[PDB]
Amino acid sequence: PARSVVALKTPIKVELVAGKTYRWCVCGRSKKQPFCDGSCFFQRTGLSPLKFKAQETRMVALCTCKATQRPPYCDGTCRSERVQKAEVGSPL
Numbered sequence: 001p002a003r004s005v006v007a008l009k010t011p012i013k014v015e016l017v018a019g020k021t022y023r024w025c026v027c028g029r030s031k032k033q034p035f036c037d038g039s040c041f042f043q044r045t046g047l048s049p050l051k052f053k054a055q056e057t058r059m060v061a062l063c064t065c066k067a068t069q070r071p072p073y074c075d076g077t078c079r080s081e082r083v084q085k086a087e088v089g090s091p092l
């Protein structure tokens with residue numbers, strides 16, 4: 001598939017709703033971060049979003065740099081110098 005790209009360099013906090021299905025953007029191209037807007041498909045990247053169903057209602061931080069080791073969640077990899085020096089829209 002295409003390489004993923006860094007969409008942003010800070011996570012987005014979202015209130016997840018128990019029982020609701022979400023589609024995390026894995027490719028970095030969505031203009032509705034942190035979730036998929038179909039860009040993965042329209043641009044024929046070969047990538048597709050990480051579908052997940054929230055088990056509890058709570059605030060979470062979803063990854064926008066797309067380099068987390070625990071997708072879909074922010075694990076602080078964005079805090080590395082590698083990500084903070086990256087250019088948005090480019091691969092890490």
Ligand code: FES
Nearest residue numbers: 025026036039040
């Ligand atoms: S827009 Fe990125 S995974 Fe769909």
Ligand code: FES
Nearest residue numbers: 063064065074078
């Ligand atoms: S935004 Fe990607 S690890 Fe924090």
